[PDB]
Amino acid sequence: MIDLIVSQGRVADRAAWMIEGAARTARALEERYGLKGHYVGEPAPHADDDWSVALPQARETLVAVREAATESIKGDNLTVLVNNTHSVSLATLPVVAREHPDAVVLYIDGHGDFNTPETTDTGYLGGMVLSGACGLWDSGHGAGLRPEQAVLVGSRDIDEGERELIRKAGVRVIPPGEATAQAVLDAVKDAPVWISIDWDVLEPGSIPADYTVPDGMLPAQIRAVFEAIPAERLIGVELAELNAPADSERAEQAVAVILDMVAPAFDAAA
């Protein structure tokens, strides 16, 4: 009752091992839950490039993920996307918002990912994902997510230019110390729920991601979110940005923590 989709094409990756980390996470889920992943996209080396070149390069992978996610969302399984980078959500979030216009998105992330081409100082596509899905800028992959239905969970050291866009759009922010079961349940109210997680939300030192933001959420807080959301309301879950070689000891330890965090939801759907 889980549909596993795995991105393996480059989508703006600047870190070296996020494709391998997605592959390793997928394999752990296949072994634990008896699944067969649907693998999409062809790998490519990482690079420190501007969004205006990385985004066109990623079109084929993004369209293939959109197609697979749409097929799963139309049916009754729990849609689970294991994504190399959070930028895959530029393709999936518009599908979620079109299919489930009543859904609330829990965007669980150490950053706000709310920059636009005008505000970004890095040029990094991964910092523009949520603003793209909400239509503040045109990614070429659609929009349609109402910012009133998007909730940033765990975000912290947000710069003031990005915080200004967040407040103007009306995106709610729950900081890590406040991201308890009660607060997340208050945020989703009575709506179907989509969860999109970037592992940089966590306190650094456990799961290697791309960015290291101090004073993050603990793994037990993530598990408490998955325990609190009723299975009947959970549409799907995206897991992004494990940065570890697929053959490494660290990828093995990291997937163990990941499996523990997601077990309340995935066990219910298994």
Q: Which spans of this chain sit near Mn ion (rule: CB under 5 A)?
A: 86, 109-111, 113, 198, 200, 209-210, 241
Q: Give the nearest distance from C-beta 198 to Mn ion in angstroms.
A: 3
Q: Give the nearest distance from C-beta 253 to Mn ion in angstroms.
A: 19
Residue of minimal CB distance from Mn ion?
Answer: 198
Type and span of the H or E element at 35: none
For Mn ion, which is the closer residue by CB, 162 or 200? 200
- Structure tokens given for 222: 């993530």
For Mn ion, which is the closer residue by CB, 75 or 214? 214
DSSP reduced 3-state for 228: helix
For Mn ion, which is the closer residue by CB, 162 or 210? 210
Q: Calculate the alpha carbon distances from 55 to 122, 129, 180 in Å.
A: 14, 11, 35
Does residue 260 have a known ligand-binding role?
Answer: no
Does residue 198 have a known ligand-binding role?
Answer: yes
Q: Give the nearest distance from C-beta 243 to Mn ion in angstroms.
A: 8
| Residue 27 burial by Cβ neighbours in a 10 Å radius (0-12, 13-18, 19+) | middle
Type and span of the H or E element at 255: helix 249-269
Q: Give the nearest distance from C-beta 124 to Mn ion in angstroms.
A: 10
For Mn ion, which is the closer residue by CB, 76 or 160? 160
For Mn ion, which is the closer residue by CB, 77 or 212? 212
| Residue 227 burial by Cβ neighbours in a 10 Å radius (0-12, 13-18, 19+) | middle
Does residue 3 have a known ligand-binding role?
Answer: no
Q: Give the nearest distance from C-beta 240 to Mn ion in angstroms.
A: 7
Q: Give the nearest distance from C-beta 113 to Mn ion in angstroms.
A: 5
CA distance 82 to 220: 20
Does residue 267 have a known ligand-binding role?
Answer: no
Does residue 113 have a known ligand-binding role?
Answer: yes
Please say whether the dihedral angle defined by the alpha carbons of residues 201, 203, 204 and 207, taken in this order, is positive or negative.
negative
For Mn ion, which is the closer residue by CB, 200 or 203? 200
Query: How crowded is residue 195: how many other Cβ atoms within 10 Å of its Cβ?
Result: 24
Dihedral angle computed from the Cα positions of residues 207, 197, 112 and 19, in that order, rounded to the nearest 10 degrees: 60
**Residues contributing to the annotated binding site for Mn(2+):** 109, 111, 113, 198, 200
Annotated binding site: 109, 111, 113, 198, 200
